[PDB]
Design a protein around this ligand. Structure first.
Ligand SMILES: [Zn+2]
Ligand SMILES: [Zn+2]
Lengths: 151, 151
């Protein structure tokens, strides 16, 4: 699966950078088929774009994949620029996405990371400097938007 | 407790609406514990919107719009069906203290125990209307149920 990790993080970061330029929270993702590297879906946080409580970058990514047979998710990696919250963690667990690759968990880390490992999922934190820099820039410019969301 | 009959009645109305629209009969609502006010209500939108993430509980939360963190702390989320790992994670993330479940016979989540271990109250009412409408869907549309449960 790891031979698609560069592709997956590059797409996730592109989604985060699209979101940033749209005036949103720079959190992006994509879902890749581990066998052939095909992109099933990609998305970014739509909190500000759509006034959305639930379209986190990971949720938006899964929504953008469309209706799938459940078996499709079982050989995928979900790429996200930021450590997933408990809701997004639960979506990974529920669909049985076996592997989650995380840009960084410096600006945010939920109990979801550990819970994924407890439920038998592989979690890889790449500690990517591009992801940390864009998230830190949003947090510095828009602290009330950030700390009102994550608390 | 005072508002539980109202909350389950609305959740069941949303499940009944989704059934009649041709979708999966799972509904919910989010009630303010202080005055019984309905913050939002929704149902599964897999068929209506081609959505893999709009479970009834997620659709309910989306339909509330972006609420202040402090608003969720005095709500109950009513769902006609046991909350899956994703919806359990949403309850945890938004900090909704109490979840009232119509039934957990057609589906029981590992999320119910996880909610209790994270300090949330889960109440299962074993509503026969909820059990009947969900069994009717599963019996008549087994292929759609297999898709909806994400196996
Ligand atoms: Zn999330
Ligand atoms: Zn769910």
């Amino acid at each position: 699966a790891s031979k698609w990790d560069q592709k997956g993080m590059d797409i996730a970061y592109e989604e985060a950078a699209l979101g940033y330029k749209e005036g949103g929270v720079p959190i992006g993702g994509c879902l890749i088929n581990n066998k052939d590297g095909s992109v099933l879906g990609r998305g970014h946080n739509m909190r500000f774009q759509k006034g959305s409580a639930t379209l986190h970058g990971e949720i938006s990514t899964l929504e953008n994949c469309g209706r799938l047979e459940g078996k499709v998710y079982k050989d995928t990696t979900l790429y996200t620029t930021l450590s997933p919250c408990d809701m997004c963690t639960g979506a990974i667990i529920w669909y049985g996405i076996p592997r989650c690759v995380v840009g960084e968990n410096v600006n945010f880390k939920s109990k979801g990371e550990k819970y994924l490992q407890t439920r038998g999922h592989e979690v890889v934190v790449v500690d990517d400097e591009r992801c940390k820099k864009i998230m830190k820039q949003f947090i510095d410019e828009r602290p009330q938007d950030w700390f009102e969301d994550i608390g």
